Structure 1
């Protein structure tokens, strides 16, 4: 199978440099173009440029000329994307894709790059406690507020993954401080509130922060 394996998520401050990579396999690397594609948060796809590793022929989209260097090391079947000096609007998902007569027929999973003057910080996990004002005749809502962390992402599970029915984990919002804040809630029978413990399990890998918070009614 054609595979495209990209390097891990990156977090940087403005002005800093960065190289990310894309390893192709399961096909003859030097017979196909590799394209780099940018997707800013909540926006569409933009082609940044294409490289033909066999020759190292390169064409950039006019917008990215001078901002980035696309390169390849054909012997280890890897393509690269480089910035000398990152700016905030370089925050995006970056996909590599094989390019041929069928367009972009295979895509990598994408590398997340976050660029901000903010520094990496782990979340404060606060309980969203269930009460009279969070019940709708039988059904009760409870949750966790995962506040003041950077960068994305965080993952949330409930009762170590044993509870998935009626869980909503919302997209984070970027606060004016440059830190993200996320809420994760679950709706349950109100009768189960007294007879069970509800724990949200929050992991923020960028800060190496794991947190398990019990959400008790009060």
Structure 2
């Protein structure tokens, strides 16, 4: 149970500030962590802050352009990406965790007093995670999606079942939500994830398999909504042979 800020879109070279926190004064005794999730590349631990506040460590990869912080008065935590590149387009996770703190070294006075001591922190777990914040880095500008029909035909029919769909092409940025018959058509619907084209614009395909008995009987309209361009699109898919 951790709440983070909404998704972010940045032109290259700029900076993005990401916030995250539990409700109120919940997990003050839990350490702050930041994990990076690149879709299809794995999980990445960036850095951490001790709940005591005597530690703030950042991994060499992110050392140059990343800042972590936490002002204890609002209890709220922050992550800062600067000098953004295209390779910084990833999902950023915050996490609260427990740990072990055991003294590894000690140096004493000649009369017994402790002169110097070093502690070592051992990660126990990351128990509480945030919803996640998506950061997108591109030179592209906001562009409304072109919607084209995937017509059902003789070639797109197997047995007694046919398939049609909408093709959402060349938009920016994500996300695009696709519906069929305003939510009335649910069974057999397959909406694939958007693919990043060579242009820098996304393309998306939403399909649904229907019996050929319905092609004349029923009407199949896809609703394509794209908030960033303030566009909602209704397109009717017909069988044109």
Q: TM-score range by the shorter chain?
A: over 0.9
C-alpha distance in 1 between matches for 2:26 and 2:36: 25
- Decide whether aligned partners of structure 1 residues 29 and 106 sit closer, same or farther in structure 2, where only a CA change above 3 A counts: closer
| Superimposed CA distance per residue, residues 80-122 of structure 1 (whole angstroms, 9 cap, x where no aligned partner) | 1112211000001111111114411121111111001111212
- Out of 94-103 and 106-115, give the one that drifted further: 94-103
Aligned with residue 140 of structure 1, among 162, 172, 180: 162
Post-superposition offset of 1:211: 1.2
Give 5+ residue unaligned stretches, structure 2: 100-123
Question: What is the aligned partner in structure 2 of residue 91 from structure 1?
Answer: 89
Residue 230 of structure 2: aligned partner? 208
Q: Which structure has the larger Rg? A: 2
Q: Counterparts of 1:73 and 1:217 in 2: how far apart (Å)?
A: 60
Alignment of 1:167-178 (within 5 A): 167-178=189-200
Q: 1:56 to 1:168 in 2, by over 3 A?
A: farther
1:201 deviates by 1.3
> After the TM superposition, which parts of structure 1 deviate over 6 Å for at least 4 consecutive aligned residues?
none
Which residue is equivalent to 1:60? 58
Q: Which has the higher helix share?
A: 1
Give the number of aligned pairs: 216
SS of aligned partner of 1:89: helix
* TM-score when normalising by structure 2: 0.85
Q: 1:157 aligns with which of 175, 179, 188?
A: 179
CA-based RMSD of the aligned residues comes to 1.5
1:5 matched residue in structure 2 = 3
| Whole-Å separation in 1 of the counterparts to 2:64 and 2:235 | 48
CA distance in 2, matches of 1:197, 1:166: 15
Which secondary structure does the structure 1 equivalent of 2:155 belong to?
A: helix
Structure 2 vs 1, CA of residues 89 and 7 (structure 1 numbering), >3 Å: closer, same or farther?
same
2:125 is aligned to 103
* Long gaps (5+) in structure 1: none
